[PDB]
């Protein structure tokens, strides 16, 4: 079972109406485990999954201290970048940072990430070699030169290849039952008459974990890719996901069609047919 840990940080300037907004969430695979929000009363790092709730005060106090240090850097980053781009102190701007690590089926390091974005565009990113930076432009290049001097990538290579992977594996066995589990999709089809000579076949995939899935329709064994409506995998709100795929069938042809479901929780891929 391959896995990942990721930290997502969002800061938004509120020119004129206070200090900037800073949201930090952490995820192991598709399960969120902590959060910190600047506009919250506690001003603490908070558990968001039960398996993390039992960590001691040392864990919570240390991550609160670190996420609050993260928060200051990102507010300073809003002014800095506004300077780089000679912007007005009136408009709201966004900086987003993501870092984490991917491990294999063997739970050994597979790759690590460190990406920064200003106003929804890539700014600077650590490359896969965890040694060089991808500076988008001149501002990004001013930052890269600061990060090169600060021996920043080298510091990050150690975190992602070490610490990240180490705590990822600790979270994995500490939340064994939760994020080392798989929920297979509960599947089913609906059929409704859109009119006298045509109808919709909707194929459903519900209560699955993790969020990946391939839900496909085929007619006479052929792919109906451009003729299928496929929604984006939604969250159900209880830690599992949902998805559907639909085709408008000419009446009399329901039997030509098959829904195909692929998910890690399924011993064998599913092929459903309305009949």
């Amino acid at each position: 079972g391959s896995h990942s840990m990721r930290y997502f940080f969002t800061s938004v300037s509120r020119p004129g109406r206070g200090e900037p907004r800073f949201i930090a969430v952490g995820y192991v695979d598709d399960t969120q485990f902590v959060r910190f929000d600047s506009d919250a009363a506690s001003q603490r790092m908070e558990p968001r999954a039960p398996w993390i709730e039992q960590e001691g005060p040392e864990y919570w106090d240390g991550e609160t201290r670190k996420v609050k240090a993260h928060s200051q850097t990102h507010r300073v980053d809003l002014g800095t970048l506004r300077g780089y781009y000679n912007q007005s102190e009136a408009g709201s701007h966004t900086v987003q940072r993501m870092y984490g690590c991917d491990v294999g089926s063997d739970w050994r390091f597979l790759r690590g990430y460190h990406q920064y974005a200003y106003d929804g565009k890539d700014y600077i990113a650590l490359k896969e070699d965890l040694r060089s930076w991808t500076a988008a432009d001149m501002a990004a290049q001013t930052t890269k030169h600061k990060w090169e001097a600060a021996h920043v990538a080298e510091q990050l290579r150690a975190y992602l290849e070490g610490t990240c992977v180490e705590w990822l594996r600790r979270y994995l066995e500490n939340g064994k039952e939760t994020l080392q589990r798989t929920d297979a999709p509960k599947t089913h089809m609906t059929h409704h008459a859109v009119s006298d000579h045509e109808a919709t076949l909707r194929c459903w995939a519900l209560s699955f974990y993790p969020a990946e899935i391939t839900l496909t329709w085929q007619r006479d064994g052929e792919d109906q890719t451009q003729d299928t409506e496929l929604v984006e995998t939604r969250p159900a709100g209880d830690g599992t996901f949902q998805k559907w795929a639909a085709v408008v069938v000419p009446s009399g042809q329901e039997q030509r069609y098959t829904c195909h479901v692929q998910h890690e929780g399924l011993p064998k891929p599913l092929t459903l047919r309305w009949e």
Partner: peptide, 9 residues
């Protein structure tokens, strides 16, 4: 756990 320290752009 979070990375520390964090450097400014």
């Amino acid at each position: 756990i979070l990375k520390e320290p964090v450097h400014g752009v």
